[PDB]
Nucleic acid binder design. Structure first.
Lengths: 63, 51, 39, 143, 91, 49, 40, 205, 145, 125, 28, 213, 63, 50, 11
RNA sequence: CGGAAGGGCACCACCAGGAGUGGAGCCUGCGGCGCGCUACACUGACGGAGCCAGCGAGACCUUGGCCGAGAGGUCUUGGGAAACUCCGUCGUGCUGGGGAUAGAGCAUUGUAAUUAUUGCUCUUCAACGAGGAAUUCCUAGUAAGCGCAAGUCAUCAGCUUGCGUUGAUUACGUCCCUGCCCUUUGUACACACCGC
C-alpha cells in the first residue's frame, strides 16, 4: 500500500482543540506545493516529516 | 576442544586437552536421546524422550 | 472437570486467634479510655 | 617480572588457590565441614560441600594479604552478610567465628600465615612467595 | 542618620576602607605591610582586574570579589598546604 | 531509668502496667538531683517501662 | 498529682460558636487586619 | 533610558526602586521587553516598553552577571555571570524555563551568532568558547592567551610578559556571517578570529 | 506516622524562623469533596495578639499573606489565639440582606509556636530569638511562654 | 623535580586524587590496574578517555590514582574525570598547549563531563 | 570551633605554610 | 600511492592492555562487539528522532537529557531502552542488571540472526513505530474514537515501551528469561512477524484508526 | 491565527471573493484597508504554494 | 475447600478488557431477526471466541 | 458556538 | 441584579506516563475509617567470591587472644551498610518464593523465665497465585528503591529527624472540558494597532 510523507510547515496554536490534540499545516514531502492541515497527537516541532495514509482528507476541529 | 555426551537426563560437555566435565545440562525430565552441534559451534540440540 | 465446594459463613489455633483478637481489641479500648480520662 | 594478588583478579585467584590447596591436601580440613551453615543469617549450607572450605581459606589469605594483619573478629565482620528476619525488616549479622578459627589455625599449621605483633595473623615470607608464584601461574595460564 | 556623616566619617574610616587594610581584614596577608608588598607584586586581583597601588578605596562588591591573581606562587602554596592542587586550572 | 538519651530517659520499674503509665502519663516529674522533666509515653514491649 | 504543661484545648461547639460570632462581629464591622499596599 | 532617534526624545527612564547600577542590557528584537543586569544585585530586571514598569527580576545567577544577549530568532536570553556560568531563559509561552552552563573560569564577554544557534564567550583565561544553544553543548573554543600584546607600565615591578594584566578579552563581536570574530580587551590589540578553522585571522595593534 | 504535627516557616533573606507544633489537623480531604477553594487573595483576622512577641508574629503572618487585598475579598482567614494556642480555619463569607453569613472551609487545627530563631533553619546554631520553657515552675500557667 | 601534576575527579560524594608523570605505561587504580576496576561492566566506561585519545602518551606517562567517597557509579565517573583532568593538566604544563587544545576539543566533542564536573543543582519552578 | 570552621576563609596566606622497642628508640 | 606516517614507536604499556582494547581504540563498538556504521534507518520521517551516529561501548552516559523537549531524541537509543526496561517496583533503577540483560539479548540475537543485533533493534523499532491513533471525542457524552496522526517522537516512545512491556509480560511468570524473550520479540518485530504483541498492538491501533478515520 | 488556519481551497475562494468586491468597488471603499491587510497576510502566508501553482483565470483575477 | 484457586473472581471493568481479541459479541434481542445457532457457529471463523 | 476562522471558512 | 466578550491560571483542568492504597498477613492512628511494614517468586530463591558511602562523638564503647555449629560466654588492650557484580545450584511446581503457627533442644538476662523475657538450632510450611468498586499523588537526582546515623525542651522509639547510595517512563503544551481569577475609560510618552 502506498504511504505518503509530509513535512511540517507551521504549527497552529490558540485554536479551540481538545487537550493533547495538535493541529498542524504540513506540506507533501514529495510535492513541495501541496499543504494540508492535519492533526498530530504527540510532541512535535516544526520542519519534521510525518507519516500519512490518507491525503485528501484534512483533520478538522475537535472542540 | 569440546564434545558432548548424552546421559541420564543430562548432557555432559567434556574438554579434550583436560578431558574433564565442562558443562552439565540437566534441565530435562527424562533421558536425552540425541545431542548434535551446529555448523557454527555454538548451538546444540538435544533430542529427549518426551517427543 | 473436578468440581469444587466453597466454604462460607485447628480448633486450638482458631481459639488462639479469637483470644488474641480479644486481647488486642480490649487492650486498645481501655488504653484509649484511660488516655482520654488522664488528659 | 614480579607480580602479586593486587595485580591478579579476585575470583579467579580464589578458585585457583582453592584448587591448588585441594590438590595439595596438607590443610587439615575439620570434621564438621559438611554441617556448618557458615553463619546464622544463612538458610542453607554451602551447595558444593567439596571445596567451599578451600575457597574460604583462599579468600581469607587473599584478604589478609590485601590487608596486613587481621583478627578473627574483623574477618567475621567482613564475611558476615545480612540476615533475613522475615516479617520484620532486615539487619546485619555475622559469620561462624569457629569456622574462621579453623581456617586460621589450618593456615598457621601450613605456615602461610603466622602470629602477628599488636595481635593478629599476617602473611609469611614463604607464603607471600607462594602467592606470588601462583599469581604468576594464574596470569600465565593462557599458554 | 545625619550625625553619622557629621561625626563618624574619619581618616580611620577611609583608611580601613583602603585596600591593604581590607586584605589584612580578610586575612589575605598576615600583616598589612605584607599586603602592601603583595599589592606591589600584583599577586592579588580585584574582581575583573588586578591591582598594584595600595592607595585604593574598594567598593563593597569588589571587596566581596577581590582575591589573588591566578597561577600565583602564593595561591599555589595555599593549595599546596591544603593539598588540593588542581593543575587543570593551573591553580 | 535504664536507658537514657540527650534530654531523654527510658525508665522501668515505676509502674506495673502501661495502663498505670497511661493513668499517670503526660505528667510533671523530677528527680533526686532536683531536676525536672515529664513522663510522656509508656513503652509497649515491657509493662511498667 | 500535678502536671508539667498546659493542656492542649479540645474544641467544642460552644467554643466555635463564640469564635464565629466574634468573626461575624469583626466582618459586620468589616474590621480586620490586611496587608495593604505601601503608598508611593 | 529609552530614546527616540526621529523625534529625538527619551521615551522612558526605567528604574529599579533601589536604582541598582545596570551594566549589561538586552532588548527584544520586536522591541517589547528590555532587560538590564547590574553588578551588586545580579537580578535580571525586565520591563515591558509600553507599560514602563518592570515585569520581573530573574534570579538564579549568584554573583554579578557579565553580559546579556538575546537570540532574536527564537528570541530567548543568555546571561553570562561570573559564577563561571551561562544561563539561558525562555520566558514566553508559559515556559519561564532555565538552562545553565558551567564553564572553566569566570566569563566576562558574551555574544550570539547572527543566525542564533551558536554563542561565543570570553572568560578571564583568554579562551573564547562557542556553544550550540539547543543542545547547550560546546561547539568549540579558541585560545587567546598567547596572541595578546599587553603593554608594560612605568610603575610596573614585573615584566609585560609575566603580567596577567589583559590576558583575556572583554568585548567580542560576531561577523554577520558568523565566521569571523573581532575581539578587544584591555590589551593593545584587536584580534580577528575565524570560526570554522578556529584560528585567528588578523591582529591590529 | 502520617500525622502532621510540626511546621516551620523561614524567611529567606536571612530572616527569622517560626517553629510550630501542629496537632488538631482536620483536612478538607478528610471531611468531604466540598469542591475547591476560591483562591482569591483572602482577608485576614487576627485575634488576641498582645505582647510584642505577638506583634512580631502578626508581622510575620501579615507579610507571608499577599499584599494589598481586595476590599471585597470573599474568603477570610482567622487567627484565633487563646491559652497560647493559636488555631485557624478557612472561612468564606457573604453579607446577608441584613447581617453576615460565613462558611468554615479548608483546614482546621491547633498549632503552637514552640520556637523562634533569628537565623535560618539551615543554621541550627544561630541565636534563638525566643525559646519555650517546658521545664519551669510556672509552665502550665504562664501565658505567652 | 619529576614532571608531575595532581588533579581530582569529583562526583556526588566521590573524590579521586590523580598523580601524573612521564613513565613506562602503567596505570594504577589504587595500586591495581585500570583492568581491575570493580563493576566489571563500566570497565569500558573508565577505559573511554584512553582509547578516545590513543595509547602513546599513556605509554610515555605513568599515573597513580587514589579514590575516596561516593557509590560505585559516582566513583567510576569521578575516576575517568580525574583521568581526563590530569592528562590535560600534564599536556598543558609539560607538553604543548596546541596539543592540549587538540585533546581538549576532542574530549569536548565526545563528552565534556570528563573535563568539567556535572553539578545537578536543584531548581524550583 | 564550629564558627571558625564555617569562616575558615580558604585564601589566607601565612608564612608558616612553607615548613626491640627500646633498641629502636636508642637508634632514633 | 600516498601514505602518512603517524606512529613511530611500538606502543608498549607496563599495564597489560588487551588486544580487544587496542582494537577498540581504533573503532569503538557496542560492548566492543557491534560497529556503529551499517546501522542506518530504513525509513524517512524517523531519522533525527533516531540518534545512532555517535559511537559508544556501553549505554550508561550520564548526560542530562531530562531538561529540554527533544533531548530524548538526542539521547542514544540503547540508553533509553535500558531506562525503559528498568521499570518495575522490583526493578526501579537497576542499570547494571539492565546493561547485562541488554548484552545477553544482543549476544542471543547475534547468535540467532548473525547480521547485526543493533540493526535488528533499529528495524524492529521502525517497524512497530505506529502511524495513526484514535482520540476519544467526548461529543458532549458521545465519546467516540476519531483517528488522527502521531508525532514520531511519540511513535518512538510508544514502540520502546511496547516492546519493553511485551518482553516483561512474556517472561513475567515463565521459565524463559527477559533477555531471550526480548531477543525473540525483537526478531519478531524485525520480521513484522505479527506473532509479536507489539506488532499486533500497533496493527490493531491502525486498524481502529483506518476504521474510524 | 484565524487567517493562518485556512486551507488553500478556502484561500482561493477568498481570492474570488476579493475579485467580486473589486467589481463592487463601492462596497470596497467601505472596508478597503481591512481588505488590503487580510489579503496581504494571506499572500505572505501562503505565498510559496500559490506561486508554485498555475491558473490563468487566477492571473487575470490578480491583474 | 481444595485451596487451589480463587474460583468466583470479582474482576476489573470492562468485559472488553476481559475479552479475547478475535471476538464476536451478540445480544439476544426479542425484536432482531431469527438465526440458527448451528449455522451461525459453522459460519463463524476458526479462531473466534463468540 | 463555533471558532473564528472556522466561521470565516464556512461563511 | 443578570447576560456577553476578551485574557490568564491550575497534576482540585485537558493531555502522557509512573507509583502506590484498597485484595492476604503484620504494625499503628481513629469508630467499622486511616498510615506504614512483608509477601505473592525466574529482572526470582539459595550458596560461595568480591567489595563502594555519608550524617552522627556529655563498668561506656573496644584492637586482639580463647573456646562454643550457633546463641554466646572468656582473658587482655585505649580512652569496611544493603541493594550491587561474577560463578554455581534451583527451576515452574501455592515449588526451595511466603514464613504464619506448633513442638523439641541449647544458651544469656533477670528473685523467679512458666504464659517460649531474649537469641539460636531442627522439625511443622497456613494464608498469600499481583489485588474489585475504586482511590490518590506527581513532571529530575524526581518518583522510587536501598541501607546508615542521632533522638539532643514541641512530638516521636516495631517511631520521628538527619545521612548516603542507585535511579527512571512520560509531559513540560493547552485552556478543549473542569473550574477559578482578571479586564471590558491605552491614560501612560514617541511609532504602529485598536477604536462605543
Amino acid at each position: 500500500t502506498p504511504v505518503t510523507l509530509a513535512k511540517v510547515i507551521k504549527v497552529l496554536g490558540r485554536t479551540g482543540s481538545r487537550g493533547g490534540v495538535t493541529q498542524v499545516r504540513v506540506e507533501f514531502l514529495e510535492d513541495t506545493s501541496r499543504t494540508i492541515v492535519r492533526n498530530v497527537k504527540g510532541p512535535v516541532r516544526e520542519n519534521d516529516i510525518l507519516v500519512l495514509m490518507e491525503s485528501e482528507r484534512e483533520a478538522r476541529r475537535l472542540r | 576442544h569440546d564434545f558432548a555426551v548424552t546421559s541420564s537426563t543430562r548432557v555432559q560437555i567434556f574438554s579434550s586437552r583436560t578431558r574433564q566435565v565442562i558443562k552439565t545440562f540437566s534441565r530435562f525430565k527424562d533421558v536425552v536421546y540425541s545431542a548434535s552441534f551446529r555448523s557454527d559451534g555454538k548451538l546444540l540440540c538435544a533430542g529427549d524422550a518426551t517427543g | 472437570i473436578p468440581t469444587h465446594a466453597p466454604k462460607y459463613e485447628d480448633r486450638t489455633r482458631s481459639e488462639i486467634n479469637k483470644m488474641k483478637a480479644q486481647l488486642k481489641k480490649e487492650r486498645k479500648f481501655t488504653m484509649k479510655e484511660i488516655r482520654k480520662d488522664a488528659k | 617480572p614480579g607480580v602479586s594478588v593486587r595485580d591478579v583478579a579476585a575470583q579467579d585467584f580464589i578458585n585457583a588457590y582453592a584448587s591448588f590447596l585441594q590438590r595439595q591436601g596438607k590443610l587439615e580440613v575439620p570434621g564438621y565441614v559438611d554441617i556448618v551453615k557458615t553463619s546464622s543469617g544463612n538458610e542453607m549450607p554451602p551447595q558444593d560441600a567439596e571445596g567451599w572450605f578451600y575457597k574460604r581459606a583462599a579468600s581469607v589469605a587473599r584478604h589478609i594479604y590485601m590487608r596486613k594483619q587481621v583478627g578473627v573478629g574483623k574477618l567475621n565482620k567482613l564475611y558476615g552478610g545480612a540476615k533475613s528476619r522475615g516479617v520484620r525488616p532486615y539487619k546485619h549479622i555475622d559469620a561462624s567465628g569457629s569456622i574462621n578459627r579453623k581456617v586460621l589455625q589450618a593456615l598457621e599449621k601450613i605456615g602461610i600465615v603466622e602470629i602477628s605483633p599488636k595481635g593478629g595473623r599476617r602473611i609469611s615470607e614463604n607464603g607471600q612467595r607462594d602467592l606470588d608464584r601462583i599469581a604468576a601461574q594464574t596470569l600465565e595460564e593462557d599458554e | 542618620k545625619i550625625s553619622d556623616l557629621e561625626n563618624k566619617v574619619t581618616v580611620s574610616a577611609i583608611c580601613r576602607r583602603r585596600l591593604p587594610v581590607i586584605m589584612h581584614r580578610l586575612k589575605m596577608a598576615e600583616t598589612i605591610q605584607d599586603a602592601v608588598k603583595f599589592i606591589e607584586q600584583g599577586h592579588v586581583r580585584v574582581g575583573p582586574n588586578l591591582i598594584n597601588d595600595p592607595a585604593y578605596l574598594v567598593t563593597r562588591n569588589m571587596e566581596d570579589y577581590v582575591t589573588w591573581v591566578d597561577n600565583s606562587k602564593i595561591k599555589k602554596t595555599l593549595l599546596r598546604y591544603r593539598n588540593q592542587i588542581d593543575d587543570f586550572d593551573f591553580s | 531509668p535504664y536507658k537514657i538519651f540527650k534530654n531523654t530517659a527510658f525508665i522501668k520499674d515505676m509502674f506495673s502496667s502501661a495502663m498505670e503509665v497511661a493513668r499517670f502519663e503526660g505528667a510533671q516529674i523530677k528527680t533526686v538531683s532536683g531536676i525536672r522533666g515529664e513522663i510522656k509515653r509508656a513503652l509497649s514491649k515491657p509493662e511498667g517501662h | 498529682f500535678d502536671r508539667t504543661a498546659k493542656p492542649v484545648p479540645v474544641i467544642t461547639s460552644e467554643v466555635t460558636e463564640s469564635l464565629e460570632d466574634m468573626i461575624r462581629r469583626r466582618i459586620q464591622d468589616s474590621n480586620f487586619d490586611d496587608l495593604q499596599r505601601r503608598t508611593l | 533610558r529609552a530614546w527616540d532617534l526621529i523625534r529625538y526624545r527619551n521615551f522612558r527612564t526605567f528604574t529599579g526602586t533601589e536604582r541598582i547600577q545596570f551594566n549589561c542590557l538586552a532588548v527584544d528584537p520586536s522591541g517589547e521587553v528590555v532587560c538590564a543586569g547590574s553588578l551588586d544585585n545580579f537580578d535580571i530586571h525586565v520591563w515591558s516598553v509600553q507599560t514602563g514598569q518592570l515585569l520581573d527580576a530573574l534570579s538564579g545567577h549568584e554573583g554579578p552577571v557579565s553580559c546579556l544577549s538575546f537570540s532574536q530568532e527564537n528570541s530567548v536570553l543568555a546571561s553570562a555571570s561570573w559564577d563561571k556560568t551561562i544561563r539561558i531563559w525562555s520566558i514566553f509561552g508559559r515556559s519561564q524555563q532555565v538552562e545553565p552552563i558551567e564553564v572553566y573560569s569566570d566569563v566576562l564577554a558574551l555574544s550570539m551568532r547572527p543566525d542564533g544557534k551558536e554563542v561565543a564567550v570570553s572568560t578571564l583565561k583568554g579562551q573564547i568558547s562557542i556553544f550550540n544553544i539547543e543542545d547547550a553543548k560546546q561547539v568549540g573554543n579558541i585560545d587567546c592567551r598567547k596572541d595578546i600584546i599587553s603593554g608594560r607600565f612605568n610603575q610596573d615591578r614585573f615584566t609585560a610578559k609575566n603580567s596577567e594584566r589583559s590576558k583575556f578579552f572583554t568585548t567580542i563581536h560576531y561577523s554577520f556571517d558568523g565566521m569571523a570574530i573581532v575581539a578587544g580587551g584591555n590589551n593593545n590589540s584587536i584580534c580577528l578570529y575565524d570560526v570554522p578553522n578556529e584560528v585567528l585571522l588578523k591582529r591590529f595593534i | 506516622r502520617g500525622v502532621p504535627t510540626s511546621l516551620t516557616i523561614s524567611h529567606f533573606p536571612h530572616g527569622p524562623t517560626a517553629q510550630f507544633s501542629l496537632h488538631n489537623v482536620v483536612m478538607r480531604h478528610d471531611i468531604i469533596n466540598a469542591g475547591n477553594q476560591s483562591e482569591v487573595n483572602p482577608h485576614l483576622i487576627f485575634d488576641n495578639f498582645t505582647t510584642a512577641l505577638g506583634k512580631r508574629v502578626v508581622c510575620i503572618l501579615k507579610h507571608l499573606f499577599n499584599a494589598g487585598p481586595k476590599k471585597d475579598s470573599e474568603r477570610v482567614i482567622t487567627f484565633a489565639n487563646r491559652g497560647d494556642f493559636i488555631s485557624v480555619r478557612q472561612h468564606v463569607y457573604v453579607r446577608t440582606r441584613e447581617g453576615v453569613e460565613i462558611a468554615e472551609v479548608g483546614p482546621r487545627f491547633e498549632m503552637r509556636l514552640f520556637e523562634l530563631r533569628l537565623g535560618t533553619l539551615e543554621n541550627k546554631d544561630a541565636d534563638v530569638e525566643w525559646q519555650l520553657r517546658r521545664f519551669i515552675r510556672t509552665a502550665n500557667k504562664k501565658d505567652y511562654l | 623535580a619529576v614532571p608531575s601534576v595532581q588533579t581530582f575527579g569529583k562526583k556526588k560524594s566521590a573524590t579521586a586524587v590523580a598523580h601524573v608523570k612521564a613513565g613506562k605505561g602503567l596505570i594504577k587504580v589504587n595500586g591495581s590496574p585500570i583492568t581491575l576496576v570493580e563493576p566489571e561492566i563500566l570497565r569500558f566506561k573508565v577505559y573511554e578517555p584512553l582509547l578516545l585519545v590513543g595509547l602513546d602518551k599513556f605509554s610515555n606517562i605513568d599515573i597513580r590514582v587514589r579514590v575516596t567517597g561516593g557509590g560505585h557509579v559516582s566513583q567510576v565517573y569521578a575516576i575517568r574525570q580525574a583521568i581526563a583532568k590530569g592528562l590535560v593538566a600534564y599536556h598543558q604544563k609539560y607538553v604543548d598547549e596546541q596539543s592540549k587544545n587538540e585533546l581538549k576539543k576532542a574530549f569536548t566533542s565526545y563528552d565534556r563531563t570528563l573535563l568539567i564536573a556535572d553539578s545537578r543543582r536543584p531548581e524550583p519552578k | 570551633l564550629r564558627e571558625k570552621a564555617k569562616e575558615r576563609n580558604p585564601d589566607e596566606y601565612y608564612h608558616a605554610m612553607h615548613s626491640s622497642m627500646d633498641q629502636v628508640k636508642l637508634l632514633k | 600511492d600516498f601514505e602518512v606516517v603517524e606512529e613511530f614507536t611500538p606502543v608498549v604499556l607496563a599495564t597489560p592492555i588487551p588486544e580487544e582494547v587496542q582494537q577498540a581504540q581504533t573503532e569503538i563498538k557496542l560492548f566492543n562487539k557491534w560497529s556503529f556504521e551499517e546501522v542506518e534507518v530504513k525509513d524517512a520521517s524517523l531519522v533525527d528522532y533516531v540518534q545512532v551516529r555517535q559511537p559508544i561501548f556501553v549505554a550508561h552516559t550520564a548526560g542530562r537529557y531530562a531538561n529540554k523537549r527533544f533531548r530524548k531524541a538526542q539521547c542514544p537509543i540503547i540508553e533509553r531502552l535500558t531506562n525503559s526496561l528498568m521499570m518495575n517496583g522490583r526493578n526501579n533503577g537497576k542499570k547494571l542488571k539492565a546493561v547485562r540483560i541488554i548484552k545477553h539479548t544482543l549476544d542471543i540475537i547475534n547468535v540467532l540472526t548473525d547480521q547485526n543485533p543493533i540493526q535488528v533493534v533499529v528495524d524492529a523499532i521502525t517497524n512497530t513505530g505506529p502511524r495513526e491513533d484514535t482520540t476519544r471525542v467526548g461529543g458532549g457524552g458521545a465519546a467516540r474514537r476519531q483517528a488522527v496522526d502521531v508525532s514520531p517522537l511519540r511513535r518512538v516512545n510508544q514502540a520502546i515501551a511496547l516492546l519493553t512491556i511485551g518482553a516483561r509480560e512474556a517472561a513475567f511468570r515463565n521459565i524463559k528469561t527477559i533477555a531471550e524473550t526480548l531477543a525473540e520479540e525483537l526478531i519478531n518485530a524485525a520480521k513484522g512477524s505479527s506473532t509479536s504483541y507489539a506488532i499486533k498492538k500497533k496493527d490493531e491501533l491502525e486498524r481502529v484508526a483506518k476504521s474510524n478515520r | 491565527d484565524a487567517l493562518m488556519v485556512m486551507p488553500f481551497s478556502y484561500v482561493l475562494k477568498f481570492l474570488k471573493f476579493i475579485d467580486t468586491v473589486m467589481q463592487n468597488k463601492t462596497l470596497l471603499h467601505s472596508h478597503l484597508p481591512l481588505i488590503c491587510k487580510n489579503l496581504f497576510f494571506i499572500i505572505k502566508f501562503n505565498h510559496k504554494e500559490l506561486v508554485s501553482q498555475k491558473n490563468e483565470e487566477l492571473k487575470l483575477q490578480i491583474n | 475447600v481444595n485451596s487451589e484457586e480463587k474460583l468466583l473472581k470479582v474482576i476489573k471493568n470492562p468485559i472488553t478488557d476481559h475479552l479475547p481479541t478475535k471476538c464476536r459479541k451478540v445480544t439476544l434481542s426479542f425484536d432482531a431477526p431469527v438465526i440458527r445457532v448451528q449455522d451461525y457457529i459453522e459460519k463463524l471463523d476458526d479462531d473466534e471466541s463468540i | 458556538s463555533l471558532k473564528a476562522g472556522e466561521r470565516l471558512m464556512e461563511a
